[PDB]
Amino acid sequence: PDDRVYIVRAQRPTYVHWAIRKVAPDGSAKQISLSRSGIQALVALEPPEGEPYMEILPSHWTLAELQLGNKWEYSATNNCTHFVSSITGESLPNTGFSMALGIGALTAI
Numbered sequence: 523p524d525d526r527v528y529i530v531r532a533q534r535p536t537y538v539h540w541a542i543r544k545v546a547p548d549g550s551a552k553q554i555s556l557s558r559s560g561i562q563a564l565v566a567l568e569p570p571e572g573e574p575y576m577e578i579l580p581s582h583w584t585l586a587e588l589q590l591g592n593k594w595e596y597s598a599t600n601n602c603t604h605f606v607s608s609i610t611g612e613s614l615p616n617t618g619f620s621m622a623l624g625i626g627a628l629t630a631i
Contacts, residue, residue, distance in 0.1 A: 559630070
């Protein structure tokens, strides 16, 4: 019940990565966003990366965690901003796609 959950923002070289992070009382953290396996984008845990942008509800974590391993169809109009916004209801600037790299910008697992 003491877990805190945030939208986090990580500036990457070609685009802005958005994620959801859960921080435990002991300061350990988990983070979910979009990654890829080869050419397949997907929802995945990732190392905590980036700066807290906005605190949100614990229930938002559950929504993200329930999507782990789902496929994602990655595009200019469907990227990490949309993943986070669809969970949280928060508007984020559509900064979350790399025109130069497209899906290549996502971290490989």
